[PDB]
Design a protein around this ligand. Structure first.
Ligand SMILES: CC(=O)N[C@@H]1[C@@H](O)[C@H](O[C@@H]2O[C@H](CO)[C@@H](O[C@@H]3O[C@H](CO)[C@@H](O)[C@H](O)[C@H]3NC(C)=O)[C@H](O)[C@H]2NC(C)=O)[C@@H](CO)O[C@H]1O
Ligand SMILES: CC(=O)N[C@@H]1[C@@H](O)[C@H](O[C@@H]2O[C@H](CO)[C@@H](O[C@@H]3O[C@H](CO)[C@@H](O)[C@H](O)[C@H]3NC(C)=O)[C@H](O)[C@H]2NC(C)=O)[C@@H](CO)O[C@H]1O
Length: 392
């Protein structure tokens, strides 16, 4: 019991190079209370493997087993398999949820799939149900999943499979797709995706995950904050304790139209240049942001949003650091939410070698410290970026 620390592990992190290369054994068994494996997949309406190397076959241990092997060292650890995500899209969910036969086909495939692979539950990551049909059918899917999980638990006499979901922070997305009271009822807990609030799809800089909106925000734009989103879900009927608030170990990047105009809400010409390890314009891992800050980048703390951003030339990144993460943990406690969720475990400074404080998992370690009272170790000190990096 207590606050949850819910960590997403992404199976594509296995393909990154050099400092970016991540494997299940890089996760400390005691780091998180839950590890969610992103992702499984759907084939012919049934739960299936994303890639053959997630599976164990021919004496070669797959990623599923290597993640679940962490429970040998920490038997309290729970694992779940996520289905969906951005790549997965919506059409396969629409089809699977559209009829009782399609739903039950999925459900009775999901239970043995999970049990045979020693997963403790299923995380539904449909992005996103949209429109009245999806809104109803999503509730029906969760409802039938939950009652089938309940029936199985009683028949096999094992603890029940968990059912969770990752849900959006955009008010339009929420209203269109989510019957919040029913959704909240059928889920064990709710992974609030409190990030991607702003990014290269907009023509001005904005933070990936501001706790509060800046005052320069239009009052439409003010809805886009962690604080507003979490409270919206409560207002709509989600129990506070079921809300696990997402925390990004990444930032979103912009190229400034003019390097002299570098504050939040400054004109941008597009996304920031790709990182060496994550190789995607508009995006950087926390440890890629660290390299910037240790190589001439300027650090700004925004005391309105309670988050930092970094500038280097015309490159702008809104990210979370040990300071913003600790402050969000205090806000989690002050508001009695259920804990913190992390996207992802593989973009923290997991080696402890990149950000300079010589602490493995500085961000997630900070989450666990603040929420569960577990020290990150003897001389584990937050990097003070205001001193380490340049200023504006
Ligand atoms: C839990 C939740 O709903 N997750 C959201 C994530 O989907 C999202 O991250 C992106 O996820 C997609 C899959 O959903 C990634 O696609 C894969 O990307 C790598 C290369 O980057 C590739 O090697 C994989 O094979 C590929 N798979 C296939 C089969 O498509 C995508 O890269 C992710 N990348 C980024 C930069 O986000 C995150 C981020 O917003 O939000 C989650 O909540
Ligand atoms: C045509 C156009 O660009 N329209 C914009 C809308 O898309 C935008 O909504 C935001 O869309 C972007 C993508 O266009 C979302 O970012 C994506 O987030 C997913 C996970 O949430 C991530 O896996 C993707 O990688 C990422 N895409 C990119 C390109 O980085 C973003 O989450 C949407 N907004 C919110 C609040 O969730 C809105 C913005 O006003 O309208 C147009 O600008």
């Amino acid at each position: 019991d207590g606050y949850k620390i819910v960590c997403y592990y992404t199976n594509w992190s296995q393909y990154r190079t050099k400092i970016g290369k991540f494997m299940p054994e890089d996760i400390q068994p005691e780091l998180c209370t839950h590890i969610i494996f992103a992702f499984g997949w759907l084939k012919k309406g049934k739960l299936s493997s994303f890639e053959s190397n997630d599976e164990t076959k021919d004496g070669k241990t797959g990623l599923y087993d290597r993640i679940n092997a962490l429970k040998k060292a920490n038997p309290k650890l729970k694992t779940l398999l996520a289905i969906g995500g951005w790549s997965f899209g919506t059409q396969k969910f629409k089809e699977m949820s559209a009829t009782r036969y399609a739903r039950q086909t999925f459900i009775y495939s999901a239970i043995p799939y999970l049990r045979d692979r020693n997963f403790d539950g299923l995380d539904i990551d449909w992005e996103y149900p949209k429109g009245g049909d999806d809104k109803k059918n999503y509730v029906l899917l969760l409802k039938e999943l939950r009652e089938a999980f309940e029936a199985e638990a009683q028949e096999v006499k094992k603890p029940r499979l968990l059912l969770t979901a990752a849900v959006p922070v955009g008010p339009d997305n929420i209203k269109s797709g989510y019957d919040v009271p029913a959704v909240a009822s059928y889920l064990d807990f709710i992974n609030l995706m409190a990030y991607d609030f702003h990014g290269k799809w907009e023509r001005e800089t904005g933070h990936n995950a501001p706790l509060y909106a800046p005052s320069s925000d239009s009052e439409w734009r003010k809805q886009l904050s962690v604080d507003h989103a979490a409270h919206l879900w409560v207002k709509l009927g989600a129990p506070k304790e079921k809300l696990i608030i997402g925390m990004p170990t990444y930032g979103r990047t912009f190229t400034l139209s003019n390097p002299n105009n570098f504050k939040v809400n400054s004109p941008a010409s597009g996304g920031g240049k790709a990182g060496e390890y994550t190789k995607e314009s508009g995006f950087l891992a926390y440890y890629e942001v660290c390299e910037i800050l240790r190589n001439g980048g300027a650090y700004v703390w925004d005391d309105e949003m309670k988050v930092p951003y970094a500038i280097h030339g015309d490159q702008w990144v809104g990210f979370d650091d040990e300071k913003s993460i600790r402050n969000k943990m205090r806000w989690i406690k002050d508001n009695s939410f259920g804990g913190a969720m992390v996207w992802t475990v593989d973009m923290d400074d997991f080696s402890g070698g990149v950000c300079g404080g010589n602490v493995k998992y500085p961000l997630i370690g900070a989450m666990r410290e603040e929420l569960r009272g577990i020290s990150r170790g003897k001389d584990a000190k937050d990097v003070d970026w205001a001193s380490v990096a340049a200023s504006v």
